[PDB]
């Protein structure tokens, strides 16, 4: 079910990443790092247990789950959320939720490339990865 987004991905295309981020009250000379950084995104799989990494030199943040259980996350940017990870139509939707607010980061397969959707506020981010070999 999970199976074609596993594997080692690479940042190829972002739009309105800088919206995302300033939404979420990223301050600007962490924006300024983050417009210019291309991540490296690794989903694995163990029976029932995803890890997500997502690598790059200025941070870098892993998380386990099991699909449709909630599980505590620290994100990149410092926020202590609850998190739920689930398959809608054939895409992988992160749901991450503090202080009654809410982000979601929608995983997507489109001719072979990974495209993540992330909304928060009015922002609606699109980044796209290319897989590795
Ligand atoms: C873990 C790498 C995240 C992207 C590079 C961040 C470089 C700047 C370092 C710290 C700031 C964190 C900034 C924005 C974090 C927003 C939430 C996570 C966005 C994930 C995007 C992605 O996976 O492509």
């Known amino acids: 079910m999970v199976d074609a987004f596993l594997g080692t991905w690479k ?16 301050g600007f ?10 991540p490296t995104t690794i989903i694995e799989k163990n029976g029932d247990i995803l890890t ?8 870098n943040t892993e998380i386990s789950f099991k699909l449709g ?3 505590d996350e ?6 202590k959320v609850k998190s739920i990870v689930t398959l ?12 009654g607010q809410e982000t979601t980061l929608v995983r ?4 072979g490339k990974l495209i ?13 990865y290319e897989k590795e070999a």
């Open 88 to 99: 809608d139509g054939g895409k992988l939707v992160h749901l991450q939720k503090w202080d």
């Open 11 to 26: 940042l190829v295309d972002s739009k309105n990443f800088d919206d995302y981020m300033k939404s979420l009250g990223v």
């Open 52 to 59: 997500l990494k997502t690598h790059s030199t200025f941070k």
């Open 29 to 38: 000379a962490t924006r300024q790092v983050a417009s210019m950084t291309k």
């Open 74 to 79: 620290t994100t990149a940017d410092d926020r």
């Open 116 to 128: 993540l959707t992330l909304t928060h506020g009015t922002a609606v981010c699109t980044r796209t």
């Open 108 to 111: 997507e397969l489109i001719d």
């Open 69 to 71: 259980v909630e599980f």
